[PDB]
Write a protein that binds this ligand. Structure first.
Ligand SMILES: [Mg+2]
Ligand SMILES: [Mg+2]
Ligand SMILES: [Mg+2]
Ligand SMILES: [Mg+2]
Ligand SMILES: [Mg+2]
Ligand SMILES: [Mg+2]
Ligand SMILES: [Mg+2]
Ligand SMILES: [Mg+2]
Ligand SMILES: [Mg+2]
Ligand SMILES: [Mg+2]
Ligand SMILES: [Mg+2]
Ligand SMILES: [Mg+2]
Ligand SMILES: [Mg+2]
Ligand SMILES: [Mg+2]
Ligand SMILES: [Mg+2]
Ligand SMILES: [Mg+2]
Ligand SMILES: [Mg+2]
Ligand SMILES: [Mg+2]
Ligand SMILES: [Mg+2]
Ligand SMILES: [Mg+2]
Ligand SMILES: [Mg+2]
Ligand SMILES: [Mg+2]
Ligand SMILES: [Mg+2]
Ligand SMILES: [Mg+2]
Ligand SMILES: [Mg+2]
Ligand SMILES: [Mg+2]
Ligand SMILES: [Mg+2]
Ligand SMILES: [Mg+2]
Ligand SMILES: [Mg+2]
Ligand SMILES: [Mg+2]
Ligand SMILES: [Mg+2]
Ligand SMILES: [Mg+2]
Ligand SMILES: [Mg+2]
Lengths: 197, 193, 136, 191, 172, 106
RNA sequence: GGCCAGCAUCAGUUUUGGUGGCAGGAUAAAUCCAUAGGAAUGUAGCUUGCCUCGGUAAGUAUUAUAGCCUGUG
RNA sequence: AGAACUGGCGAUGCGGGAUGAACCGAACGUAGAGUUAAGGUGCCGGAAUACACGCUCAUCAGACACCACAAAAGGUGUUAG
RNA sequence: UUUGCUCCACACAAUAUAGAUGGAUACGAAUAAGGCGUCCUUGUGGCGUCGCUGAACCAUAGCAGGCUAGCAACGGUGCACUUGGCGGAAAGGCCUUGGGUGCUUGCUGGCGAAUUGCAAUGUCAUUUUGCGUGGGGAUAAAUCAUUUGUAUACGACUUAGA
């Protein structure tokens, strides 16, 4: 529909975000996902922590280097859920995956490019209210990830600049609305009403 | 952590310059000769580099090197290295550095008597070493055929692979070590019989 | 220094709440909640709109802010008489909701030519507004 | 089975005003002010009048409803804590070694410092929590008093101390040594 | 087992010389079609009479339609069922708008709460509870308090497209 | 003007297939804005062009086209099956495709 | 008339829509109308009792200043 | 380990059961179109993140015949009797 | 080593392409709550309004968009300049000044279009490189061999040499 779709990870459910991202890729839709630290997994924090240490024990007995790799970063956790849903040892699969980019925080280009959401993987729209769940950022830091603080800091900085951008814009469209107003009740205006505008 | 700029002194001792090269004698020794220019124009460009460090930068390191000529060594090409600065604020840090360009610093300004210090260095080298001396493995009995400074069993039958955790002949020494808690018993001065 | 407690102010399932039917043969049509069966099923009726008295799943309907006085379990005739009494139709019709509905039904009906006209008309509007939004 | 609604009443008295947006509760009265986050629950608060606030659950299960009452109590205990306030008392208890208890300060600290427990050469240090003030009761033997606006902080500071004086490797039926909470009540007298 | 209709089924033992005009017995049967319904009939008759279908005939089969399909009704329901380790009688109350609707949710419920498939149940009786206050199970009584009203918090709109540009709101 | 498009955007997705066996003779097409089989009935018979590029010029062009037709709908979400003059290459699963408006019935 | 196509009219197979006429049943059951009787999750009225000038509540009260249920047609 | 009747495998690919001699489905000339079986339809993967009523929260939940195991006995978890 | 290198410019040649074909159109936070407007005592404030999907918003007419004239406006927008400022998370992009110049479908005119023959993507994008041209700019080093021994099985390492 658009050449690149930027998804705001926050408030999404890992494997349901994963399931739709894999699909879009396979159909040729480039995707970039942001704020993966604000991703969710259902089930309370301890469970997913336990689940992750289950992951941690798996390694190649003769050489831990050739064995399964344990990426700690919230984006790489996410990529894992994704890669798992893509026939990734085929050329078609590799291709699909290049269409993907995953980030912690919203770094440049993407901080000034719009981001969308994916309602069928929105936590607040899927999980029964009451059910315990888990923020990726917190799950990651507890298994080694080093950069929550510096993402948090950068984000807070970024969030200041974007509230300005916003404030300006909302101020510019108060005028713009104060325009669509004189123009109201005019011939061209009610003519456009007639045709549904 | 990522580096975003380096600002250099205007004049650089041949010693460090020698470090930037693999065939000094044949070279035209052109290192930093255009950079050295940058100072010329009032300073403008060097300033904004110091300026930018100050604006950003969560940490500051200095670029120092050794006066190897003041040393009996033959080796003549000096050693260059980054030292974190740990005094005051970021700005105060760079100011300090800028001020100390081409200027000189001594141990008494960083170590004192009885201080506990660590030492980072590369371990003496020994070349290809059999398993006995390299891991402190048992000498196998005198009666054993095909030699006895060995490990008798290199693994069970499964995993059917030699494992990363058994001892094997190979390079010994010429390793990095970071060895700690060495007390300074003396800080000597050279101009001091 | 009064207390001040938010609120949160939901449309209620109740006798006399008007609802918009979203799925089905009816669909787009309004109706009234007559009686009430459990947390998930209610009995609806909408004579003015031609929708048959029926039990329906709440999930197929969307509650509207409109309500009118109905006796619980009032039959179809009685329902028609209170509905008209309270002129719920024009009330609905007055609403931004229904208006937004009607608008896109209209947009949907535009001839290709009519569309071309709409574009010409927007160029036109854009010209005088871009002016206004530019002087002050 | 899902009850369609149960609700609770939260009485409000002449001194205080309580304001709740989202589910961020703030009760303010004479003895200061307390705020508490209830976002982890899902209830619906409603002002009926300056002395009354209802709290309700729609279409809730057992565990949900179960939680509804404890919401009522928490905000109650905030209101009281902000009118009457709380006062927990504890007594030192020992069979031979006088338990010596004082207040120290390291870098604007305030700590409860326990010496000589059961002879122990070690020195114990419970932090004074912010909100809670600690006074060694005059006219009473080996009594310590912890008062404040927050039942939670006062009670918790209490138990931190009583736990700092657990006995190990002894029959704790025989070695009953410790500091134990001995009266739970209010600050403002008469009531 | 499906979407039920309710049938009257009438049957009798075949006639004989010394007994023409055998007695004629009727059952109300809830089933999705007349084939299942005539089968259920013989099933139950063979638990009551010396008959089988090989020596009897169905006399009449007739679908019974709800008398007031848009009047809400409180149903008393009596059921016999089989569990894994024993067989058991139960009384449930169901509130819907037709016996047919009532029986559909029962079988559902029996399946969900007790893991009883269709083979394991016997409707013993389904009857409209006339006056309230003979309504006995609370999960229903709840719904007959005067001037009853309730919200449906946390509204969940269905998306029609995979990407949204807003961020939903569960208001209602 | 700025747009000149006279076709509907679309995407080569799969060949017709089993879990473990595909059939190159039938291609599966997702059409922009078609969500249901009812919606997709409009396009049955419309003609598809997969337009691609090449290094060798041919009949004076470096652009080539594989032509096909939409033949039936597919599943519940407005996907469509199509056959082509020559089966589509399969490096093109996920490549764009053009669904024209002819043969027309409006 | 070699190669490859487009449209039209047909034939074989098949898929997917729109629309017309009928048959059956409790000659569907409902709604609706008419009528008889009833009750409460009791509408008006009334009583008494608190109560910021009429609002609540607990009585009475079966169509009244809402309605519903059941049978028969 | 040994018998009875049938049906298979052996001698046989094909679709399903991830995988597999024997299970389910279905038996084979070269092909086009259609419809299905058993089995599936979040993504890997063709096919509803379909509809509907319930139940279930597990600091070692559970997840589909053959089949790749769990029992006595307990619970004031929760559900309906 | 027969005139090499680099940035800007255009010209020709070649080679590609995981797949342009109006526009990736920027708060944050909550969801048992929010957005927007407005007032105020500036707050967990009063009052209004909105949702129930982007089915939107914006753009969109002109030989794939030709050549021309005028009016009403002083607005819009492309381009290249120039003014002041911002952005280091991968900033490499955003905002602001000023004159110039083009276009304007805001409205009204003149001319052109056919024969591509009833469809044939009917070719209008962006990769990398190669050869010359002339406008700026810049004029190294590494390796072998020799040599040290803080190194070494051999390579490698570490030194030294106008
Ligand atoms: Mg730089
Ligand atoms: Mg040796
Ligand atoms: Mg040893
Ligand atoms: Mg040793
Ligand atoms: Mg050994
Ligand atoms: Mg020997
Ligand atoms: Mg013990
Ligand atoms: Mg002992
Ligand atoms: Mg009946
Ligand atoms: Mg041909
Ligand atoms: Mg035909
Ligand atoms: Mg018909
Ligand atoms: Mg009424
Ligand atoms: Mg009647
Ligand atoms: Mg068999
Ligand atoms: Mg054999
Ligand atoms: Mg076979
Ligand atoms: Mg197979
Ligand atoms: Mg299996
Ligand atoms: Mg896979
Ligand atoms: Mg699929
Ligand atoms: Mg469907
Ligand atoms: Mg079994
Ligand atoms: Mg139990
Ligand atoms: Mg490619
Ligand atoms: Mg509001
Ligand atoms: Mg505001
Ligand atoms: Mg407000
Ligand atoms: Mg919009
Ligand atoms: Mg033009
Ligand atoms: Mg990037
Ligand atoms: Mg013109
Ligand atoms: Mg040149």
């Amino acid at each position: 529909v658009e050449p690149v779709v930027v998804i705001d990870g926050k408030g999404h459910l890992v494997g349901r975000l994963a399931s739709v991202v894999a699909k879009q890729l396979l159909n040729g839709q480039k995707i970039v996902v942001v704020r993966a630290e604000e991703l969710n997994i259902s089930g309370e924090f301890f469970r997913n922590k336990l689940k992750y240490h289950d992951f941690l024990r798996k390694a190649t007995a003769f050489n831990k280097t050739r064995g399964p790799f344990h990426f700690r970063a919230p984006s790489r956790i996410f990529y894992k859920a994704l890669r798992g849903m893509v026939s990734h040892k085929t050329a078609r699969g590799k291709a699909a995956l290049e269409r993907l980019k995953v980030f912690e925080g919203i770094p440049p280009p993407y901080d000034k490019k719009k981001r969308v959401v994916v309602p069928q993987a929105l936590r607040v729209l899927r999980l029964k209210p009451g059910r315990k769940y888990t923020t990726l950022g917190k799950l990651s830091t507890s298994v080694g990830w080093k950069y929550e603080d510096v993402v948090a800091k950068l984000e807070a900085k970024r969030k200041v600049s974007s509230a300005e951008y916003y404030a300006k814009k909302r101020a510019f469209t108060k005028k713009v609305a104060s325009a669509n107003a004189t123009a109201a009740e005019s011939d061209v205006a009610k003519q456009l009403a007639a045709l549904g505008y | 952590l990522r580096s975003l700029t380096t600002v250099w002194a205007e004049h650089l001792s041949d010693e460090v310059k020698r470090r930037f090269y693999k065939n000094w004698y044949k070279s035209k020794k052109k290192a930093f000769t255009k950079y050295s220019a940058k100072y010329a124009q009032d300073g403008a460009g060097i300033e904004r580099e110091l300026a930018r460090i100050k604006k950003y930068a969560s940490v500051v390191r200095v670029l120092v090197h050794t006066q190897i000529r003041k040393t009996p060594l033959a080796q003549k090409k000096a050693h260059l290295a980054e030292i974190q600065l740990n005094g005051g604020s970021i700005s105060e840090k760079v100011d300090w550095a800028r001020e100390h360009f081409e200027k000189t610093v001594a141990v008494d300004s960083v170590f004192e008597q009885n201080e506990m210090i660590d030492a980072i260095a590369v371990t003496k080298g020994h070349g290809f070493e059999g398993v006995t001396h390299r891991w402190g493995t048992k000498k196998l009995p005198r009666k054993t055929h095909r030699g006895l400074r060995k490990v008798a069993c290199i693994g069970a039958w499964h995993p059917a692979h030699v494992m990363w955790s058994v001892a094997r002949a190979g390079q010994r020494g010429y390793h990095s070590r970071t060895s700690i808690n060495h007390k300074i018993y003396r800080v000597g001065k050279g101009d001091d019989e | 220094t009064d207390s001040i407690v938010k609120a949160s102010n939901w449309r209620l399932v109740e006798v006399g709440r008007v609802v918009l039917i979203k799925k089905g043969q009816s669909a787009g049509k309004l109706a009234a909640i007559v009686e009430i069966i459990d947390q998930k099923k209610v009995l609806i009726d909408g004579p003015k709109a031609g929708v048959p008295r029926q039990a329906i799943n709440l999930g197929q309907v969307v509650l509207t802010p409109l309500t009118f006085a109905l006796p619980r379990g009032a039959r179809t005739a009685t329902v028609s008489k209170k509905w008209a009494a309270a002129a719920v139709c024009e009330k609905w019709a007055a609403s931004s909701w229904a208006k937004k509905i009607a608008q896109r039904e209209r947009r949907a009906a535009l001839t290709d030519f009519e569309r071309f006209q709409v574009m010409v008309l927007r160029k036109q509007k854009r010209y005088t507004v871009k002016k206004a939004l530019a002087k002050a | 089975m899902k009850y369609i609604q149960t609700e609770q009443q939260i009485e409000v008295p002449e001194g205080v005003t309580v304001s709740i947006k989202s589910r961020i509760v703030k009760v303010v009265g004479p003895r200061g002010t307390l705020t508490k986050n209830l976002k982890h629950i899902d209830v619906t608060f409603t002002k009926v009048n300056n002395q009354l606030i209802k709290v309700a659950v729609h279409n809730g299960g057992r565990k949900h409803v179960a939680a509804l009452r404890t919401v009522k109590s928490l905000v109650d205990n905030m209101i009281t804590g902000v009118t009457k306030g709380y006062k927990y008392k504890m007594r030192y208890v020992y069979a031979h070694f006088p338990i010596n208890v004082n207040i120290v300060e390291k870098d604007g600290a305030k700590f409860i410092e326990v010496r000589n427990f059961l002879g122990d050469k070690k020195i114990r240090n419970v932090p004074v929590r912010d909100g809670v003030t600690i006074e060694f009761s005059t006219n009473v033997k080996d009594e310590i008093v912890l008062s404040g606006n927050s039942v939670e902080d006062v009670s918790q500071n209490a138990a931190d101390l009583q736990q700092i004086c657990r006995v190990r490797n002894k029959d704790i039926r025989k070695f009953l040594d410790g500091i134990y909470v001995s009266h739970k009540g209010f600050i403002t007298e008469d009531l | 087992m499906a979407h039920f209709k309710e049938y009257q089924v009438i049957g009798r033992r075949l006639p004989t010389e010394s007994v023409p005009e055998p007695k004629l017995f009727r059952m109300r049967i809830f089933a999705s079609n007349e084939v299942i319904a005539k089968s259920r009939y013989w099933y139950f008759l063979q638990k009551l009479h010396k008959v089988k279908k090989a020596s009897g005939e169905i006399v009449s089969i007739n679908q019974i339609n709800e008398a007031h399909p848009t009047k809400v009704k409180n149903f008393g329901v009596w059921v016999r069922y089989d569990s894994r380790s024993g067989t058991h009688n139960m009384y449930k109350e169901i509130r819907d708008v037709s016996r047919v609707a009532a029986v559909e949710t029962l079988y559902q419920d029996m399946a969900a709460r007790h893991r009883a498939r269709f083979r394991s149940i016997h409707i013993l009786k389904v009857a409209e509870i006339e006056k309230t206050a003979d309504v006995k199970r609370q999960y229903v009584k709840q719904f007959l308090t005067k001037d009853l009203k309730f919200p449906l918090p946390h509204r969940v709109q269905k998306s029609t497209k995979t990407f949204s540009y807003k961020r939903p709101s569960t208001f209602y | 003007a700025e747009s000149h498009r006279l076709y509907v955007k679309g995407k080569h997705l799969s060949y017709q297939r089993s879990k473990r066996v595909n059939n190159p003779n039938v291609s599966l097409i997702k059409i922009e804005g078609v969500a249901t089989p009812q919606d997709a009935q409009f396009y049955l018979g419309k003609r598809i062009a997969y337009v691609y590029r090449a290094s060798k010029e041919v009949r004076g062009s470096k652009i080539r086209v594989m032509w096909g037709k939409v033949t039936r709908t597919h599943g519940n979400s407005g996907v469509v099956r199509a056959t082509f003059r020559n089966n589509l290459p399969a490096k093109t699963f996920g490549a764009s495709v053009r669904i024209f408006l002819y043969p027309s019935n409006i």
